[PDB]
Write a protein that binds this ligand. Structure first.
Ligand SMILES: COc1ccc(Nc2c(F)cc(-c3c(C)noc3C)cc2Cl)c(C(=O)O)c1
Ligand SMILES: O=C(O)CNC(=O)C(=O)O
Ligand SMILES: [Fe+3]
Length: 425
């Protein structure tokens, strides 16, 4: 089993004993001006329609998340959850930018409140590391969420209606904290009030917690609580917003990173003039393995990921329009690089040099064929035909065999099997 609410007498003591790194700051800790500006910036994004239900993937199935979301954060940053990489609507129409400036200000307070609470947790634990404390609270993005109840029951502690089921927040730096601003309009828990559920991983015997959330309430998952504990969102009655500020692990998920990866792969190309005549400087297996691995990374983790969302964020900002075309152009050159590798393996080389190249690009080429088949189906599913027109997925970049603009075709089975047969015969 069962759950425990502030009604139960064991509540406060079970909190400090099994969920101690959970910190709740009631609305009394927010300025009424701050709460009004955030709720207005909140309500502004609902009128403009900047909150979208992402088309995620779970256990091979394509799912529509019942919660409408938007990723706001540092420019050129990303946050990948459930095989769907969200791109940041950056912070410092005019009402859209004012809201991002608002949530940037909300990010500053929560970062200051997290550092204070994290320093308090060090004193209670003690009875250098200050670089990790400031780093674990340096929130780079925030994920806004919408849920109008106008539903799966909690299957472990009898908490009832759930908006978001049990999960850990993915794509987070190790031991990084999470701050959430909640905003909503006797034999258990109140179904009309919004709660946040909490439980220990692998464990349904320890009674879980149901923290009631009112307008302006804030809770903080500190240190390893996200790793040690799972959390859910218990449905209420009135529609509810939320602002979850995270330290997104983006060591390989920023624009500057993927741009550097593209330059590294194009160091193997004579960059005198952009044309269809791609001449590779080297044919060593390592640099050819690297060039085609970055080929897959820039296409599937960025290109196919961005256009699968159909540029919903274009309804908010045009920040990614130029970089995505730049990545599209850099990826087009890599397709000419792949052809340059293919045009060389079929040259009168030796066989010992030909075999050393096949083993380098074999796995990288098949993955490009398998992932292109997944993305072709992800953009064309019975659920993927029901979104609004301005949000439907686009299978970009796509081209037919008649398309003479591309040096290589889409379907690679007539090329990977010809390459697979060469490694044998
Ligand atoms: C019917 O299709 C769906 C799709 C998503 C669902 N919830 C859900 C989610 F949207 C996001 C996360 C999540 C992760 C991982 N990391 O950060 C975040 C944020 C985790 C979950 Cl669990 C649900 C559902 O809860 O029932 C259903
Ligand atoms: O809003 C909350 O309390 C947290 N729930 C989430 O779905 C999330 O963080 O994305
Ligand atoms: Fe969450």
């Amino acid at each position: 089993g069962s759950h425990m609410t502030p009604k139960d007498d064991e509540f406060y003591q079970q909190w400090q004993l099994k969920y101690p790194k959970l910190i709740l700051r009631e609305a009394s800790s927010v300025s009424e001006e701050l709460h009004k500006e955030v709720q207005e910036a909140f309500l502004t994004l609902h009128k403009h329609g900047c909150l979208f239900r992402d088309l995620v993937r779970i256990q091979g199935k394509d799912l529509l998340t019942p919660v409408s979301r938007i990723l706001i954060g540092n420019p050129g940053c990303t946050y990948k959850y459930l095989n769907t990489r969200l791109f940041t609507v950056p912070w410092p129409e005019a009402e859209i930018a004012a809201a991002c400036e608002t949530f940037l200000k909300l990010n500053d307070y929560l970062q200051i409140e997290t550092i204070q609470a994290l320093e308090e947790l060090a004193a209670k634990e003690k009875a250098q590391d200050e670089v990790d404390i400031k780093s674990r609270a340096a929130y780079n993005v925030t994920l806004l969420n919408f849920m109008d109840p106008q539903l799966k029951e909690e299957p472990y502690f009898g908490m009832g209606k759930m908006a978001v089921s049990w999960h850990h927040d993915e794509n987070l730096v190790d031991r990084s904290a999470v701050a959430v601003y909640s905003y909503s309009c006797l034999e258990g828990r109140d179904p009309d009030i919004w709660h946040v559920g909490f439980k220990i991983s692998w464990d349904i015997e320890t009674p879980g917690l149901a923290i009631p959330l009112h307008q302006g309430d804030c809770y903080f998952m500190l240190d390893d609580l996200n790793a040690t504990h799972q959390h859910c969102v218990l449905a209420g009655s009135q529609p509810r917003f939320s602002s979850t500020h995270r330290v997104a692990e983006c060591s390989t998920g920023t624009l500057d990173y993927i741009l550097q990866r593209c330059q590294l792969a194009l160091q193997n190309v004579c960059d005198d003039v952009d044309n269809d005549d791609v001449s590779l400087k080297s044919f060593e297996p390592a640099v050819l393995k690297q060039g085609e691995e970055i080929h897959n990374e820039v296409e599937f983790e960025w290109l196919r990921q961005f256009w699968f969302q159909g540029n919903r964020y274009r309804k908010c900002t045009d920040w990614w329009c130029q970089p995505m075309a730049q990545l599209e152009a850099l990826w087009k050159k890599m397709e000419g690089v792949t052809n340059a590798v293919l045009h060389e393996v079929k040259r009168e080389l030796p066989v010992e040099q030909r075999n050393e190249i096949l083993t380098a690009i074999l796995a990288s080429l098949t993955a490009r064929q398998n992932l292109r088949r997944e993305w072709h189906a992800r953009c064309q599913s019975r659920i993927a035909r029901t979104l609004p027109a301005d949000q439907k997925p686009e299978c970009r970049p796509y081209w037919e065999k008649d398309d003479a603009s591309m040096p290589l075709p889409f379907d690679l089975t007539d090329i990977v099997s010809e390459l697979r047969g060469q490694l044998l015969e």
